[PDB]
Amino acid sequence: DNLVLIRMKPDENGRFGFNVKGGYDQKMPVIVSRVAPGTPADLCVPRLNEGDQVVLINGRDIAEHTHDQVVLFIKASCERHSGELMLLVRPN
């Protein structure tokens, strides 16, 4: 509950501007650890924030996935809808 659905297109070089920590191999939830100024993650509707817990990536439940599996899902450009990365997050 209290979930926020964010869509964002990458910059011209394929970057979104956020960092993540966590994943199944780290025994902790996937959390946004940094959002860089002026990047898609900082300028989206609403902003992606540090501490937000990632629940879905492009509709996919990532609970049992490792950190690097989550990184590849973020970079999987063909799983985006209309070029937008979709994140379903829980604010801290």
């Binding site: 956020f18 993540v20 966590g22 940094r34 690097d68 990184v71 590849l72 973020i74």
Partner: peptide, 13 residues
């Protein structure tokens, strides 16, 4: 990993 910098278990996307 996946052509993104990883350090301290944190990846830049």
């Amino acid at each position: 990993s996946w052509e993104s910098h990883k350090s301290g278990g944190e990846t830049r996307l």
